[PDB]
Scaffold this active site. Structure first.
Site, mmCIF file in Angstrom:
data_model
loop_
_atom_site.group_PDB
_atom_site.id
_atom_site.type_symbol
_atom_site.label_atom_id
_atom_site.label_comp_id
_atom_site.label_asym_id
_atom_site.label_seq_id
_atom_site.Cartn_x
_atom_site.Cartn_y
_atom_site.Cartn_z
ATOM 1 C CG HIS A 37 3.265 -1.907 1.469
ATOM 2 N ND1 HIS A 37 2.101 -2.655 1.559
ATOM 3 C CD2 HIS A 37 3.940 -2.448 0.332
ATOM 4 C CE1 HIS A 37 1.856 -3.238 0.387
ATOM 5 N NE2 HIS A 37 3.118 -3.094 -0.271
ATOM 6 C CB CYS A 84 0.755 -3.596 5.890
ATOM 7 S SG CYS A 84 0.715 -2.291 4.971
ATOM 8 C CG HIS A 87 -2.342 -2.483 2.277
ATOM 9 N ND1 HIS A 87 -0.904 -2.125 2.096
ATOM 10 C CD2 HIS A 87 -3.244 -1.862 1.503
ATOM 11 C CE1 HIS A 87 -1.114 -1.156 1.093
ATOM 12 N NE2 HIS A 87 -2.387 -1.142 0.864
ATOM 13 C CG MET A 92 0.521 -6.696 3.994
ATOM 14 S SD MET A 92 1.089 -5.429 2.907
ATOM 15 C CE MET A 92 2.812 -5.600 2.946
HETATM 16 CU CU LIG Z 1 0.893 -2.691 2.717
#
Ligand SMILES: [Cu+2]
Length: 99
Positions: A37, A84, A87, A92
């Site tokens: 991440h 992120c 994601h 996210m």
């Molecule tokens: Cu992530």
């Protein structure tokens, strides 16, 4: 304030995702689940004179291990939207308010 990168149930999210802090207050983003991440501040959604590079990872930068962290303190007052990179679509994302 501690923020988990990925929930304990494996969900691709920031925990918490929305929060308020005071200027200089440390934010510790910690790899939890579903890593790698990163944490990227949306340059169009932060206080207009703020340099996103001083507070963000690049979209290419990644936290690779469980427990690895990205620490940043925000100074300028206002709303800061972040996500992120890998994601984002999954949801996210978050928003921190400095007041
Ligand atoms: Cu992530």
């Amino acid at each position: 304030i501690d923020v988990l990168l990925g929930a304990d149930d494996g969900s691709l999210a920031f925990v918490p995702s929305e929060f308020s802090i005071s200027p200089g207050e440390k934010i510790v983003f910690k790899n939890n689940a579903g890593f790698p991440h990163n944490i990227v501040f949306d340059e169009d959604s932060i206080p207009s004179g703020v340099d996103a590079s001083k507070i963000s990872m690049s979209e290419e930068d990644l936290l690779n291990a469980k427990g690895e962290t990205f620490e940043v303190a925000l100074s300028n007052k206002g709303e800061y939207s972040f996500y992120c990179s890998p994601h984002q679509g999954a949801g996210m994302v978050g928003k921190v308010t400095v007041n």
